[PDB]
């Protein structure tokens, strides 16, 4: 069983309250995991304001953006859950600010607050389809130039719909609808028995 | 200020799905039953919507099963019937929801088995 | 017009169908006795107004709505169908 | 209802943007067919542009339209700032794939699941 | 031919694959190789087949050789034992 | 009232007095690890793996068997109730033979998982294990019983759900082995359920011995077509061939059980199966040819022949969607000679009111009945999961069962009124003894089997029963929604066919012979080619070549219910949807399309081109077809009787006898069944 | 191998082969499973 | 997965005992080459504030003089029990960072030495058959071990529902996995933070007014492995 120090779960908890108090217009929920990690949750409109306070506040300097990601809970009305993980080299602590964005309700861009996000925001658009206003140059980064569809969405087939082969007749690479020679065997793995109350 | 739209969010135009697999694919929203083999009920809790099954022809060289349908192995899991129906409407897939069927309460008591006249 | 079948798609416990069902209760037997071969189908729709579907010869089907119609109007409409 | 506007307050304003993009593509088709040495006819290509711009003619919601041009603009950028080579462009024409008939009898004769 | 009677029909075309090539098969077939090993005449009702070699063998299992008529066969090795 | 409040970890759930501790946890949502407790099987307490800790109590209690009491707090996850599981699982595993990579209940084990979730990580049993001699209990269940955790659910099911009362415990100590003392096979329908109900893989299925492993199996939920109870089932398919059919729970129709026929005849589904469309060659043998050629063979003959020269003898497992596509086609050439092989009497109101031909007291209404008058059918072998219904309601409730048929093994105590159709008149007169028994019944139900109707005096038998139901209803003064008269079928496509207005019986085709006949899945001998006109131009539309294929000028292969999204309806009219588990084989195609295509090749072209459309079609001809899982409440018995009174017929003295007299009769009936190697092995085992 | 020879098990090969890929001894992959859906062969006797 | 072979530690010593000289040699060829310096010195200088802003998080930060080694600031495993010196740099430029990478090669030999000197006797996997697969002798003689072996390999750990971002100090820089997890045995999301997605982005702000050869030098000073960036 991992060793857990409650010093952190107390320090981080307090900070959470501090952030919440300072930014009550946007903070909806602020929780600390059992793993000693804080996760302020903000209304999408608070993207710019909450980050800026953390990047430039003496009692909470969160200078670098570790990551910007978007889990996709299809059930959730607001499908995407943009999560921004930040690090404070001054206070040696990380916080995560997570917002919610639906497919056609764009989030603001923080390239202003952290220029690290210039690329990750393009990554989130390419994979999940969330759009970021005021982004300097939003354009697909990881997917092919002509790719249609946002791949990491839970509703996108793994194999996808198009695959490439070289055709002599046309002497050029050519998409064709995917035809797989051994479909992905979809093993069902969930057991019908729960583990604990959680 | 917000604008008004009565149009059912249909975003079929943004999802990026080939036309054939949006108009010929029927998905069923169902709560999975329990394989009678096991008596655990933790897999009969969340609703799932599953796309209609398609061709699985044998492969000539190795005899492996081969499928031409991309949306086959995809089964999305939705916590409530209302949310799953919403996914079908905005993605434009046809849906045919099946009501959850939960075991009816059954009265049991060890005494009965020793009944004077059963 | 060769009549092959008549389908009375009444809808149970529906306000409008009252007339249709009343017809069934009071005159259905009679109609059948009269036309003892013709198949008169009593079926039960839902969330739809009643319809007296009639199938004429060579696969032609015709429709007469029975929504909110009195018992004899249903009787008259049925009688008009098997002329 | 009660939705927030992405970039266009109403289908009207949005349509303005579509007009601009159409023009953009229309003016660009010829250049691409020359800078990529594509074996297509400018007229032919320009019809394709029309095809696509109408494939999505049915959309009534302003927000969906706005994203559609954002995406459309992005595609143009990949074809005028050339990062998309012929293989990419010609794919639009679906040149190699064999067309599938939509006639019921046709499908019956060929596929188990139509 | 193969362990499971896998023999392409006289008309199947996968036989083209074997044209100008060897269809890989193994002369040593298990169904037969196990038979050769004789039944072990143990003197205890229940004996265990660890698989030979302990950890380097198969999961340990106990076999009931009580049935006088038949002989116990390890679901793993196929080795047979009789009392 | 009657609502104690018990706390499950302080959640103040409220339960009727009588609920067990395990049941209290269920409504909160917690699940007590359990073995030997099945919802529809008596509580036995054998495993003691469910020990929980009611608060402030010295010892832990048996969940499944402890009537909850007011105030109790269950403490299901209390340190104690975990030692009470960490220490039981120690024992079950200690004598267990670790052949989990042999036990085909590998991922389907309620003992590994309950061990991986509620038990310990290691073992301390340094001692030796035990071994129990196996048993050849039958040709369907492989009892590798060294696996048995002596949980006695088999001995219960084999006594309580099925009335076999054969399996039993033998001996005491650690060599209590739960196997038949003498080696007598467990031969009964409902037999295969033991597999599904033994959580251990001691006894499992012998055909599905080692063909698969459960994580791989893709599971598609569909409907039983072998019998007319329409039991819900899950078809487990791997890489495109069905591997197993196991039950899925439907409270009203099959509550977690399925028949021996509809779970071991999935093998029959894979051989003797038609795939390519052959046509009769000049030489006189069926030659495989492309659809285009085979379809126009049929279309050309269809255009040449006028109405009443074209007929269809459908029957067996054909779906409602094909049945409306075959009627819409033959009416577009004006023959309404569409018919079914099973003759349902149609001289009074038949097919017109939808209660003359339905078991309208629901399968779940057998539970609230009082006296059942089984007349002329063997439910045990015609509707096995309805025989079970009368089994449960004769045990847990008090149904008084009476049979007017052959004295036959019914798995319960019935009263054999006699083997004569005319004694039905005896009760109507009030002459026979059971006349009062019914008089004493507040909620009675008659059930006239379809096989009695299949005799020549079937019209008279239905009329005679309707008279008795009439005065039974009058004397009892039973309430209107309680419905005494119901008739059960034994053919899946009979209620759907009668629903779409198909007229039962091939009597009409018998009087005027059609130049053309579409045998839509008919393997019955109702008409033969000698009987047909000289031309004898008939085209088989079906899946397995059995009786209709070798006497067929054209073969248009179709699919089976594992291979199409068709609809079926059981006996009380509950329409249900089969889902495509596997794509249809060869060039074979869905039944509805073959007929839509033949129509397009003929020039009368059915209006429906996509399933959803064929369905919308079903809606116009009939209601049940489109609304699924929905029994139709109202019926018009009173006007049915009036026409029955007009009909005058003689019930011949010949006793009415069910065709399935004993279980060998049952195993092979339909096409898929007949084509079953497993069913064939079962047949020879009986013989 | 000379010093401590290997265990012989009366199935192990005595002539081991090199890459047979370009030579006609090469593995040609094939499905070893038998047919799955047997078909109804027509009746050869004219009706 | 499995304990070290019986004898590896000794060889990870012989090598370590000598590798230094090998690093020393490279040095006599490049650290002071009259020419390495030129093509590397004062090329791609990144300010300290800008390095934190663009999320560089690696030698790239350390080279600019920011002192941050996640291995000292947020210890993971037993990197806390060892003693090493982070090689911080000044006048951050391609040459300085290089010197830093040669210095961590040196400092890692100091950490390796210790690990060989102080590695404890014990087991190499958690004893919870729940999470770690049972030993093969145990699964072949004990029923609870087979069941745990079968379930672990076929189904899985069944991690409790939650989400975590854990970052180590991978050689390139901060490598982090944000692993959201439902109670299921298979994960729900696993964004891999790649030290490299951030570094490449900086190529623009580093190579400004630079020659074609300069771009080649800067891609090298970011240790870009396209696997981590592309994921
Ligand atoms: C040769 C190379 C081929 C490449 C062609 C081109 O790049 C691809 C492309 O068209 S990029 C997507 C264009 N798609 C839109 O720009 C959205 C259009 N939005 C609507 O159509 C609305 O429904 C509206 C209300 C405006 C209907 O009004 P209207 O019918 O247009 O007037
Ligand atoms: S039953 Fe079969 S699977 Fe479950 S544990 Fe015993 S052996 Fe392993
Ligand atoms: S056989 Fe299956 S059910 Fe019957 S006792 Fe042994 S385990 Fe319990
Ligand atoms: S379930 Fe409680 S005794 Fe077996
Ligand atoms: Zn062995």
Curated annotation (Swiss-Prot), chain A:
What EC number(s) is this enzyme filed under?
7.1.1.2
Q: From the UniProt record, list the reaction(s) this protein catalyses.
A: a ubiquinone + NADH + 5 H(+)(in) = a ubiquinol + NAD(+) + 4 H(+)(out)
Q: EC class of this enzyme?
A: translocase
Gene Ontology cellular-component terms for this entry are:
mitochondrial inner membrane; mitochondrial membrane; mitochondrion; myelin sheath; nuclear body; respiratory chain complex I
Topology in membrane: Peripheral membrane protein
Please classify the protein's predominant subcellular localization into one broad category: mitochondrion
Where does the UniProt annotation locate this protein?
Mitochondrion inner membrane
GO biological process entries: aerobic respiration; mitochondrial electron transport, NADH to ubiquinone; mitochondrial respiratory chain complex I assembly; proton motive force-driven mitochondrial ATP synthesis; reactive oxygen species metabolic process
Any one GO MF term held by the record is: NADH dehydrogenase activity
Keyword RNA-binding (UniProt): no
Q: Which UniProt keywords apply?
A: Electron transport, Membrane, Mitochondrion, Mitochondrion inner membrane, NAD, Oxidoreductase, Respiratory chain, Transit peptide, Translocase, Transport, Ubiquinone
Q: How does it assemble?
A: Core subunit of respiratory chain NADH dehydrogenase (Complex I) which is composed of 45 different subunits. Interacts with NDUFAF3. Interacts with RAB5IF. Found in subcomplexes containing subunits NDUFS2, MT-ND1 and NDUFA13.
The entry assigns this protein to a family as follows:
Belongs to the complex I 30 kDa subunit family.
Entry function = Core subunit of the mitochondrial membrane respiratory chain NADH dehydrogenase (Complex I) which catalyzes electron transfer from NADH through the respiratory chain, using ubiquinone as an electron acceptor. Essential for the catalytic activity and assembly of complex I.
Curated annotation (Swiss-Prot), chain D:
Q: Does the keyword Mitochondrion apply?
A: yes
Q: Entry's InterPro entries? A: Complex1_LYR_NDUFA6_LYRM6, NADH_Ub_cplx-1_asu_su-6
Domain of life, source organism = Eukaryota
**What biological-process GO terms show up in the record?**
aerobic respiration; mitochondrial respiratory chain complex I assembly; proton motive force-driven mitochondrial ATP synthesis
Does the keyword Membrane belong to this entry? yes
Its assembly, as annotated, is: Mammalian complex I is composed of 45 different subunits.
Main function:
Accessory subunit of the mitochondrial membrane respiratory chain NADH dehydrogenase (Complex I), that is believed to be not involved in catalysis. Required for proper complex I assembly. Complex I functions in the transfer of electrons from NADH to the respiratory chain. The immediate electron acceptor for the enzyme is believed to be ubiquinone.
Concerning its family, UniProt says: Belongs to the complex I LYR family.
Name of the protein described by the UniProt record = NADH dehydrogenase [ubiquinone] 1 alpha subcomplex subunit 6
Q: Which organism is it from?
A: Mus musculus
From Swiss-Prot, chain F:
Every 4Fe-4S His(Cys)3-ligated-type domain range:
80-119
Sorted alphabetically, the Gene Ontology BP terms of this entry are: aerobic respiration; mitochondrial electron transport, NADH to ubiquinone; mitochondrial respiratory chain complex I assembly; proton motive force-driven mitochondrial ATP synthesis
Provide the topology term for how it sits in the membrane. Peripheral membrane protein
Phosphoserine is found on 433
Could you name the domain of life of the organism this protein comes from? Eukaryota
Output a single Gene Ontology CC term carried by this record: mitochondrion
**Boundaries of every 4Fe-4S Mo/W bis-MGD-type domain copy:** 217-273
PTM summary: Acetylation of Lys-56 is observed in liver mitochondria from fasted mice but not from fed mice.
Signal peptide extent? none
Every 2Fe-2S ferredoxin-type domain range: 2-80
Sequence positions that bind [4Fe-4S] cluster 2:
148, 151, 154, 198
Pfam families per the UniProt record, alphabetical = Fer2_4 (PF13510), Fer4_NDSU1 (PF22151), Fer4_Nqo3 (PF22117), Molybdopterin (PF00384), NADH-G_4Fe-4S_3 (PF10588), NADH_dhqG_C (PF09326)
What the entry lists under PROSITE patterns is as follows: 2FE2S_FER_2 (PS51085), 4FE4S_HC3 (PS51839), 4FE4S_MOW_BIS_MGD (PS51669), COMPLEX1_75K_1 (PS00641), COMPLEX1_75K_2 (PS00642), COMPLEX1_75K_3 (PS00643)
Residues annotated to bind [2Fe-2S] cluster = 36, 47, 50, 64
Q: Could you say which tissues express the protein in this record?
A: Brain. More abundant in neurons than in astrocytes (at protein level).
Its UniProt entry gives the catalysed reaction(s) as:
a ubiquinone + NADH + 5 H(+)(in) = a ubiquinol + NAD(+) + 4 H(+)(out)
Instruction: Tell me where in this chain the PTM N6-acetyllysine is found.
Output: 56, 439, 471, 681
Offer an example of a GO molecular function term for this protein.
4 iron, 4 sulfur cluster binding
Provide the cofactor note recorded for this chain's UniProt entry. Answer: Binds 1 [2Fe-2S] cluster per subunit.
The positions annotated for binding [4Fe-4S] cluster 1 are: 96, 100, 103, 109
Family membership:
Belongs to the complex I 75 kDa subunit family.
* Protein name per Swiss-Prot or TrEMBL: NADH-ubiquinone oxidoreductase 75 kDa subunit, mitochondrial
Species annotation: Mus musculus
Q: What is the lineage of its organism?
A: Eukaryota, Metazoa, Chordata, Craniata, Vertebrata
Curated annotation (Swiss-Prot), chain H:
Keyword Transferase annotated:
no
Specify the superkingdom: Eukaryota
Specify which residues bind [4Fe-4S] cluster according to the UniProt entry for this protein: 94, 100, 115
Query: Residues of the signal sequence?
Result: none
Q: Which UniProt keywords apply?
A: 4Fe-4S, Acetylation, Electron transport, Iron, Iron-sulfur, Membrane, Metal-binding, Methylation, Mitochondrion, Mitochondrion inner membrane, NAD, Oxidoreductase, Respiratory chain, Transit peptide, Translocase, Transport, Ubiquinone
Predominant location category: mitochondrion
- Compartments, as annotated in UniProt: Mitochondrion inner membrane
An example of a GO molecular function for this protein is: metal ion binding
Instruction: List this protein's GO terms for biological process.
Output: aerobic respiration; cellular response to oxygen levels; gliogenesis; mitochondrial electron transport, NADH to ubiquinone; mitochondrial respiratory chain complex I assembly; neural precursor cell proliferation; neurogenesis; proton motive force-driven mitochondrial ATP synthesis
* Consequence of gene disruption: Knockout mice show early perinatal death and major defects in the CNS, compromising especially the postnatal development of dorsal cortex, corpus callosum, hippocampus and cerebellum. Neonatal neurogenesis and gliogenesis are deeply impaired.
Query: What GO cellular-component annotations does this UniProt entry give?
Result: mitochondrial inner membrane; mitochondrion; respiratory chain complex I
In the record, the note on similarity to other proteins reads: Belongs to the complex I 49 kDa subunit family.
On subunit structure and binding partners, the annotation says: Core subunit of respiratory chain NADH dehydrogenase (Complex I) which is composed of 45 different subunits. Component of the iron-sulfur (IP) fragment of the enzyme. Interacts with NDUFAF3. Interacts with NDUFAF7. Interacts with CERS2.
Q: Which residues of the full protein are shown?
A: 233 to 463 of 463
């Amino acid at each position: 069983v991992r060793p857990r120090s409650d010093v952190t779960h107390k320090q981080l908890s307090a900070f959470g309250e501090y952030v919440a108090e300072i930014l009550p217009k946007y903070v909806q929920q602020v929780q600390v995991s059992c793993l000693d990690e804080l996760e302020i949750c903000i209304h999408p409109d608070g993207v710019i304001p909450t980050l800026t306070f953390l990047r430039d506040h003496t009692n909470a300097q969160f200078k670098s953006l570790a990551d910007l990601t978007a889990v996709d809970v299809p059930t959730r009305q607001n499908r995407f859950e943009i999560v921004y993980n930040l690090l404070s080299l001054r206070f040696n602590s990380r916080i995560r600010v997570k917002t919610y964005a639906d497919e056609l309700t764009p989030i603001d861009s923080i390239v202003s607050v952290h220029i690290a996000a210039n690329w990750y925001e393009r990554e989130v658009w390419d994979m999940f389809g969330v759009f970021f206003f005021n982004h300097p140059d939003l354009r697909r980064i990881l997917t092919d130039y002509g790719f249609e569809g946002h791949p990491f969405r839970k509703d996108f087939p793994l194999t996808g719909y198009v695959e490439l082969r070289y055709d002599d007749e046309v002497k050029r690479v050519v998409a064709e609808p995917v035809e797989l020679a051994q479909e992905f065997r979809k093993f069902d793995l969930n057991s019908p028995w729960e583990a604990f109350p959680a | 200020q917000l604008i008004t739209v009565d149009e059912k969010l249909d975003i079929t135009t943004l999802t990026g799905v080939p036309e054939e697999h949006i108009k010929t694919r029927k998905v069923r929203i169902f709560v999975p039953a329990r394989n009678n083999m096991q008596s655990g009920v933790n897999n009969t809790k969340k609703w799932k919507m599953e796309f209609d099954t398609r061709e699985r022809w044998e492969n000539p060289l190795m005899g492996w099963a081969s499928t031409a349908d991309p949306l086959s192995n995809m089964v999305l899991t939705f916590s409530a019937k209302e949310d799953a129906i919403a996914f079908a409407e905005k993605n434009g897939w046809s849906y045919d929801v099946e009501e959850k069927k939960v075991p009816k309460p059954k009265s049991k008591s060890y005494g009965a088995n020793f009944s004077w006249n059963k | 017009l060769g009549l092959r079948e008549i389908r009375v798609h009444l809808c149970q416990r529906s306000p409008g169908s009252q007339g249709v069902r009343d017809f069934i209760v009071q005159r259905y037997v009679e109609l059948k006795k009269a036309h003892p071969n013709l198949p008169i189908l009593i079926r039960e729709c839902s969330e739809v107004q009643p319809k007296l579907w009639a199938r004429y010869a060579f696969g032609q089907e015709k429709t007469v709505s029975l929504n909110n119609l009195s018992a004899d109007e249903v009787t008259r409409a049925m009688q008009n169908v098997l002329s | 209802t009660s939705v927030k506007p992405i970039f266009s307050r109403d289908l009207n304003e949005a349509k303005r943007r579509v007009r601009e993009l159409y023009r953009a593509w229309y003016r660009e088709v010829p250049n691409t067919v020359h800078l990529m040495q594509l074996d297509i006819t400018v007229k032919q290509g320009r019809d394709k542009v029309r095809e696509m711009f109408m494939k999505n003619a049915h959309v009534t919601d302003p927000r969906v339209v706005d994203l559609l041009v954002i995406k459309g603009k992005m595609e143009l950028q990949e074809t005028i700032k050339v990062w998309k080579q012929r293989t990419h462009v010609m794919r639009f024409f679906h040149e190699t794939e064999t067309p599938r008939p939509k006639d019921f009898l046709s499908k019956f004769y060929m596929g188990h699941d139509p | 031919i193969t362990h499971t009677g896998q023999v392409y029909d006289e008309k199947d075309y996968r036989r083209v694959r074997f044209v100008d090539r060897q269809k890989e098969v193994n002369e040593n077939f298990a169904i037969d190789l196990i038979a050769q090993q004789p039944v072990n005449e143990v003197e205890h009702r229940i004996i265990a087949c660890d698989g030979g070699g302990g950890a380097l063998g198969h999961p340990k299992v106990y076999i009931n050789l009580d049935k006088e008529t038949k002989t116990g066969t390890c679901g793993y090795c196929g080795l047979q034992f009789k009392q | 009232s009657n609502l104690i409040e018990v706390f499950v970890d302080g959640q103040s759930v409220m339960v009727e007095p009588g609920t067990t501790v395990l049941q209290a946890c269920e409504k909160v949502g917690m699940q007590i690890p359990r073995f030997c407790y099945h919802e529809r099987l008596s509580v036995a307490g054998n495993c003691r793996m469910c020990l929980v800790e009611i608060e402030k109590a010295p010892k832990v209690v048996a969940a499944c068997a402890m009537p909850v009491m007011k105030g109790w707090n269950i403490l299901t996850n209390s340190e104690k109730s975990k030692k009470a599981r960490e220490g039981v699982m120690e024992f079950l595993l200690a004598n267990h033979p670790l052949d989990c990579p042999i036990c085909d209940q590998g991922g389907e084990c309620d003992l590994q998982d309950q061990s991986m979730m509620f038990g310990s990580d290691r073992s301390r049993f340094l001692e030796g294990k035990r071994a129990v001699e196996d048993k050849n209990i039958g040709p369907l269940v492989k009892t590798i019983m060294t696996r048995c955790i002596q949980c006695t659910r088999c001995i219960r099911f084999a006594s309580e759900i099925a009335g076999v009362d054969d399996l039993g415990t033998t001996g005491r100590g650690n060599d209590m082995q739960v196997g038949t003392y003498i080696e007598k096979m467990f031969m009964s329908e409902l037999s295969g359920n033991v597999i599904d109900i033994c959580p251990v893989g001691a006894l499992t299925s012998k055909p599905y011995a080692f063909t698969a492993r459960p994580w791989e199996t893709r599971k598609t939920e569909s409907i039983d077509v072998m019998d007319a109870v329409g039991s819900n089932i899950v078809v487990s398919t791997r890489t495109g061939e069905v591997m197993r059919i196991l039950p899925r729970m439907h409270e009203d129709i099959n509550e977690e059980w399925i028949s021996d026929k509809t779970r071991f005849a999935y093998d029959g589904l894979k051989r003797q199966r038609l795939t390519e469309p052959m046509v009769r060659n000049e030489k006189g043998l069926l030659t495989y040819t492309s659809w285009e050629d085979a379809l126009s063979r049929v279309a050309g003959m269809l255009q040449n022949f006028e109405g009443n020269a074209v007929a269809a003898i459908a029957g067996g497992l054909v779906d409602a969607e094909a049945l409306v596509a075959l009627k819409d086609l033959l009416n577009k050439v004006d023959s309404d000679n569409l018919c079914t092989e099973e003759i349902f009497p149609t001289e009074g109101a038949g097919t017109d009111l939808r209660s003359n031909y339905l078991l309208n007291t629901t399968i779940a209404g057998v539970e609230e009945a009082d006296v059942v008058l089984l007349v002329g059918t063997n439910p045990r072998f015609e509707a096995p999961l309805f025989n079970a219904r009368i089994r449960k309601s004769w045990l847990h409730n008090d149904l008084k069962v009476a049979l007017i048929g052959s004295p036959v093994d019914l798995t319960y105590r019935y009263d054999h009124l006699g083997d004569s159709p005319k004694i039905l008149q005896d009760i109507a007169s009030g002459r026979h003894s059971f006349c009062e028994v019914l008089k004493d019944a507040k909620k009675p139900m008659v059930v006239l089997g379809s096989s009695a109707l299949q005799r020549d005096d079937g019209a008279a038998i239905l009329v005679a029963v309707s008279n008795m139901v009439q005065k039974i209803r009058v004397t009892t003064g039973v309430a209107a929604e309680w419905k005494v008269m119901n008739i059960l079928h034994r053919i899946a496509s009979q209620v759907a066919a009668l629903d779409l207005g198909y007229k039962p019986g091939v009597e009409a085709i018998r009087k005027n012979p059609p130049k053309m006949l579409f045998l839509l899945g008919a393997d019955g001998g109702c008409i033969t080619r000698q009987d047909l006109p000289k031309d004898c131009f008939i085209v088989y539309q079906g899946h397995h070549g059995d009786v209709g294929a070798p006497m067929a000028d054209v073969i248009l292969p179709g699919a089976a219910y594992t291979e199409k999204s068709a609809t079926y309806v059981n006996t009380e009219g509950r329409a249900q949807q089969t889902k495509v588990a596997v794509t249809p084989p060869g060039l074979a195609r869905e039944d509805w399309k073959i007929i839509r295509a033949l129509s397009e090749i003929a020039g009368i072209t059915l209006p429906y081109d996509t399933l959803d459309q064929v369905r919308n079609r079903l809606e116009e001809v009939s209601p049940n077809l489109v609304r699924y899982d929905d029994i139709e409440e109202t019926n018009y018995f009173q006007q049915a009787s009036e026409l029955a009174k007009l009909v005058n017929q003689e019930v011949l003295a010949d006793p009415l006898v069910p065709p399935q007299l004993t279980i060998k009769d049952f195993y092979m009936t339909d096409s898929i069944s007949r084509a079953s190697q497993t069913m064939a092995k079962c047949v020879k085992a009986v013989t | 191998p000379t010093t401590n020879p290997p265990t012989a098990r009366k199935f192990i090969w005595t002539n081991h082969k090199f890459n047979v890929s370009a030579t006609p001894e090469q593995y040609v992959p094939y499905s070893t499973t038998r047919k799955k859906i047997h078909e109804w062969v027509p009746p050869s006797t004219p009706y | 997965h499995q304990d070290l072979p019986l004898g590896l530690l000794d060889d990870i010593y012989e090598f370590s005992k000598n590798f230094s000289l090998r690093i020393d040699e490279v040095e006599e060829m490049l650290t002071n080459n009259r020419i390495w310096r030129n093509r590397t010195v004062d090329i791609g200088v990144v300010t300290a504030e800008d390095a934190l802003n663009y999320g560089f998080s690696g030698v790239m930060l350390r080279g600019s003089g920011i002192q941050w080694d996640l291995r000292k600031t947020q210890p993971y495993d037993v990197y806390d029990q060892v003693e090493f010196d982070v090689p911080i740099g000044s006048r951050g430029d391609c040459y300085d960072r290089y010197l830093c990478r040669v210095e961590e090669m040196r400092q890692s030999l100091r950490i390796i030495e210790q690990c060989l000197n102080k590695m404890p006797p014990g087991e190499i996997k958690v004893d919870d058959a729940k999470v770690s697969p049972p030993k093969r002798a145990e699964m072949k003689t004990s029923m609870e071990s087979l069941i745990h072996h079968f379930k672990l390999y076929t189904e899985g750990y069944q991690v409790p529902p939650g989400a975590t971002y854990t970052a180590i100090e991978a050689p390139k820089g901060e490598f982090g996995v944000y692993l959201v997890s439902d109670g299921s045995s298979r994960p729900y999301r696993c964004k891999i933070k790649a030290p490299g997605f951030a570094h490449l982005a900086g190529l623009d702000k580093m190579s400004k007014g630079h020659m074609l050869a300069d771009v080649v030098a800067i891609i090298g000073t970011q240790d870009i492995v396209f696997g981590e960036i592309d994921r």
